[PDB]
RNA sequence: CGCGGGGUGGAGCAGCCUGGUAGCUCGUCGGGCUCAUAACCCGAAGAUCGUCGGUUCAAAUCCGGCCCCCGCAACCA
RNA sequence: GUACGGCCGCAAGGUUAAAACUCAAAUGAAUUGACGGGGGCCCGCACAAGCGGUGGAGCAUGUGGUUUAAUUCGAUGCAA
RNA sequence: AAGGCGGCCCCCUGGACGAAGACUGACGCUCAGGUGCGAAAGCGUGGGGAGCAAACAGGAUUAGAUACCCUGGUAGUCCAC
């Protein structure tokens, strides 16, 4: 409180701790698929959510979501990951970029295609 | 492993070599020793001790055995305890009095022969 | 004479909880009572294949020193199974 | 859309894990973590540690399955 | 032919040298307590006291046989 | 108030004091209920005071269970 | 000052408050670091030991009862450093 006190010990803003450290301030990172599996989510939800463990080009190894309905990914699949947690999946803090590198687009999508790596259908 | 090859022939041979090694086939083993048991004794731990006399080869501890009567195999297993007298030696040669017992073997009858074989 | 006292071994009574009251059950036997184990399954007329005869059997097998059991019963009556345990009988 | 690679194979409740969770051993081959289906939980239907049950398994993760048929 | 301790109710005991309807525990089946269950509480069922001869007023307990279980014992490579 | 480092202690331990990870909460006071074998005050055949019962018996009846080709469906703590 | 301090008597000693006036003349307030004090339990050595009582033993309760209740009871609770 005292002026004297601040003069001895200045106000010191807290440094923000990141939510996607594996990215190391990069917009995406590349990595190899270590395990490709499903996992169940947290109260109150229930499903078999597709996730993968991925060793990134910078050594970090993280779990990443594989959004969309259907995917053709396996071990040694080289994928691109981006920031973005999965809320009912604790530990999951990244998303896989559908339709980049070895990851295919979602099949048969018509709405929100660009978020699922899907070309515009000839029509 | 980093290996570079000038010719494709030296490569096509070694990849095959890598593959051949990968295989793990055991098509049959060589008996280490063959022994006949006589005059069964009773033990609290294993339930039975079958007195034996080795006719051929050397009997060993951890090597698997095949118990057969009248040419057909009554029971199979791996030795747990090889003990002669109070010595409990791990190895017994042929034509030397020997002793044997194993778990999960209920009935000891004379005239049958136990075949031990290394793998 | 020999009395009937009792112990129970419910499911979720493992080593922790269990052999503490295997100590209690020694005590019963070692008074010179016939210590009756009662299982009390979360279960039925065949509750288990697990609940009972891990416990019971290992209670025998650990206590086997001092006590033995009359029978390894494995006929449940109701949702609960008595294994009867006694002093180890002098022949 | 909803793909159709789901299955309905059966099995028997093995373990009585926490929060409507079970070891359910598939008559088929092994057992999976099996969680209680929403429906089923909404209609209660307690589930003892030793019942024949139906499971919904996503090939995506055979390791897991949902209990559909109550008993 | 070879020692120990026991035989009572479904299981395990007490009642023994202190010989007059065999009672005390766990189980069994009910009842009570609870919204309900576990637990607990009130209760009833449940016996040639191994089997016989002796011995006695009446012997569970009294003796000895037949017999059975356990005990260590005996098979302890 | 943990780890690492330092100082302290015979020891038990004390003192100074982080980060990763994880969640969208955690928290304070007050409000309306509900609940109490936390408390106070107060009511009802709630207890206490009484009279007669049920629990035993035989039969009537409903249910469970068991059985059956079928023993039709429903009602299930007080409130089946 | 806080921790905490209770039979009676003496000895040594700290602080607080009141009355009156004299003296000193801002000698004051606060205080990181430093120093000292600091219930109970606990520790070391030697004493002491009635009552109480961790631990521990026994009796009960209970489905269990390493508890609550009972019969005992060691450290400790007491003194010096």
Swiss-Prot record, chain A:
GO molecular function, one term: misfolded RNA binding
Effect after changing residue 56 to H: Protein is not incorporated into ribosomes
Superkingdom in the source lineage: Bacteria
Pfam families recorded: Ribosom_S12_S23
Keywords from the UniProt entry: Acetylation, Antibiotic resistance, Methylation, Ribonucleoprotein, Ribosomal protein, RNA-binding, rRNA-binding, tRNA-binding
GO CC entries: cytoplasm; cytosol; cytosolic small ribosomal subunit; ribosome
Residues that span the membrane, as ranges: none
The keyword tRNA-binding appears for this protein: yes
Modified residues (3-methylthioaspartic acid): 88
N6-acetyllysine: residues bearing it: 107
Listed Gene3D superfamilies: Nucleic acid-binding proteins
UniProt KW tRNA-binding keyword: yes
Described function: With S4 and S5 plays an important role in translational accuracy. Interacts with and stabilizes bases of the 16S rRNA that are involved in tRNA selection in the A site and with the mRNA backbone. Located at the interface of the 30S and 50S subunits, it traverses the body of the 30S subunit contacting proteins on the other side and probably holding the rRNA structure together. The combined cluster of proteins S8, S12 and S17 appears to hold together the shoulder and platform of the 30S subunit.
Complex and partners: Part of the 30S ribosomal subunit. Contacts proteins S8 and S17. Interacts with ArfA. May interact with IF1 in the 30S initiation complex.
Other information: At least 19 substitutions or deletions in 11 codons can promote streptomycin resistance, dependence or pseudodependence; all but one of the streptomycin resistant mutations (K42R) are associated with hyperaccurate translation and thus reduced translational efficiency. The streptomycin sensitive allele is dominant to resistant alleles.
PANTHER family, sorted: 30S RIBOSOMAL PROTEIN S12 FAMILY MEMBER
Family in the record: Belongs to the universal ribosomal protein uS12 family.
Protein name: Small ribosomal subunit protein uS12
From Swiss-Prot, chain B:
Deleted gene: phenotype: Essential, it cannot be deleted. The C-terminal region (residues 165-890) is sufficient for growth at 42 degrees Celsius, although it grows more slowly at 37 degrees and is cold-sensitive at 30 degrees Celsius.
Function: One of the essential components for the initiation of protein synthesis. May protect N-formylmethionyl-tRNA(fMet) from spontaneous hydrolysis. Promotes N-formylmethionyl-tRNA(fMet) binding to the 30S pre-initiation complex (PIC). Also involved in the hydrolysis of GTP during the formation of the 70S ribosomal complex. Upon addition of the 50S ribosomal subunit, IF-1, IF-2 and IF-3 are released leaving the mature 70S translation initiation complex.
Post-translational changes noted in the entry: A proteolyzed form, called IF2 gamma (begins with residue 290), can be detected during purification which has all the activities expected for this protein, although it is slightly less efficient than full-length protein. It is not clear if it exists in vivo.
More about this protein: When overexpressed partially suppresses the slow growth and decreased 70S ribosome phenotype of an rsgA knockout; RsgA may be involved in 30S ribosomal subunit biogenesis. Silent mutations of codon 158, which no longer function as alternative start codons, decrease beta isoform expression to 31 to 50%, the strongest mutation is GUG to GUC.
Record lineage: Bacteria, Pseudomonadati, Pseudomonadota, Gammaproteobacteria, Enterobacterales
Record's note on what induces expression: Part of the metY operon that extends to pnp.
Protein family: Belongs to the TRAFAC class translation factor GTPase superfamily. Classic translation factor GTPase family. IF-2 subfamily.
Protein name per its UniProtKB record: Translation initiation factor IF-2
Gene label: infB
Source organism of the structure: Escherichia coli (strain K12)
UniProtKB/Swiss-Prot annotation, chain D:
Coiled coil: none
An example Gene Ontology molecular-function term: ribosome binding
S1-like domain ranges (all copies): 1-71
Gene3D superfamilies referenced in this protein's UniProt entry, alphabetically: Nucleic acid-binding proteins
Keyword flag Protein biosynthesis: yes
Chief place where the protein resides: cytoplasm
Keywords: Cytoplasm, Initiation factor, Protein biosynthesis, RNA-binding, rRNA-binding
Pfam family, one: eIF-1a
Gene Ontology cellular component list: cytosol
Localization terms from the record: Cytoplasm
Complex and partners: Binds to the 30S ribosomal subunit, contacting protein S12 and the 16S rRNA. Component of the 30S ribosomal translation pre-initiation complex which assembles on the 30S ribosome in the order IF-2 and IF-3, IF-1 and N-formylmethionyl-tRNA(fMet); mRNA recruitment can occur at any time during PIC assembly.
Main function: One of the essential components for the initiation of protein synthesis. Binds in the vicinity of the A-site. Stabilizes the binding of IF-2 and IF-3 on the 30S subunit to which N-formylmethionyl-tRNA(fMet) subsequently binds. Helps modulate mRNA selection, yielding the 30S pre-initiation complex (PIC). Upon addition of the 50S ribosomal subunit IF-1, IF-2 and IF-3 are released leaving the mature 70S translation initiation complex.
Family under the similarity heading: Belongs to the IF-1 family.
UniProt name for this protein: Translation initiation factor IF-1
Species assigned in the record: Thermus thermophilus (strain ATCC 27634 / DSM 579 / HB8)
Classification lineage: Bacteria, Thermotogati, Deinococcota, Deinococci, Thermales
């Amino acid at each position: 409180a005292t002026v004297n006190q601040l003069v001895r010990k200045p106000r010191a803003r807290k440094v923000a701790k990141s939510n996607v450290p594996a990215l190391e301030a990069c917009p995406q990172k590349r990595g190899v698929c270590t395990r490709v599996y499903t996992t169940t989510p947290k109260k109150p939800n229930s499903a078999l959510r597709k996730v993968c463990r991925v060793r990134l080009t910078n050594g970090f190894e993280v779990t990443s979501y594989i959004g969309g309905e259907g995917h053709n990914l396996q071990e040694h699949s080289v994928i691109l990951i981006r920031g973005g947690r999965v809320k009912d999946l604790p530990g999951v803090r990244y998303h896989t970029v559908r339709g980049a590198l070895d990851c295919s687009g979602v099949k048969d999508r018509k709405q929100a295609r660009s978020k699922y790596g899907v070309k515009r259908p000839k029509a | 492993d980093l290996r570079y090859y000038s010719v494709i022939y030296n490569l096509i041979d070694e990849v095959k070599a890598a593959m051949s090694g990968m295989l793990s086939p055991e098509l049959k083993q060589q008996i280490i020793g063959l022994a006949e048991v006589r005059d069964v004794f009773k033990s609290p731990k294993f339930g039975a001790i079958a007195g034996c006399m080795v006719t051929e080869g050397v009997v060993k501890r951890h090597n698997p055995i095949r118990v057969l009567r009248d040419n057909v195999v009554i029971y199979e297993g791996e030795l747990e305890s090889l003990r002669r007298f109070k010595d409990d030696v791990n190895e017994v040669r042929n034509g030397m009095e020997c002793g044997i017992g194993v778990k999960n073997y209920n009935d000891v009858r004379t005239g049958d022969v136990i075949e031990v074989f290394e793998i | 004479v020999i009395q009937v006292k009792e112990i129970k071994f419910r499911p979720g009574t493992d080593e922790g909880d269990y052999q503490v009251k295997l100590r209690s059950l020694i005590r019963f036997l070692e008074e010179g009572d016939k210590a009756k184990i009662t299982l009390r399954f979360r279960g039925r007329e065949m509750a288990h294949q697990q609940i009972g005869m891990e416990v019971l059997n290992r209670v025998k097998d650990d206590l086997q020193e001092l006590a033995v059991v009359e029978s390894f019963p494995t006929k449940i009556e109701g949702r609960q199974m008595i294994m009867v345990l006694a002093p180890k009988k002098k022949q | 859309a909803k793909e159709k690679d789901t299955i309905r194979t059966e099995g028997v409740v093995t373990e009585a894990l926490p929060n409507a969770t079970f070891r359910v051993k598939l008559d088929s081959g092994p057992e999976i973590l099996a969680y209680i289906s929403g429906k089923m939980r909404m209609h209660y239907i307690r589930i003892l540690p030793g019942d024949r049950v139906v499971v919904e398994i996503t090939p995506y993760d055979p390791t897991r399955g949902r209990i559909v048929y109550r008993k």
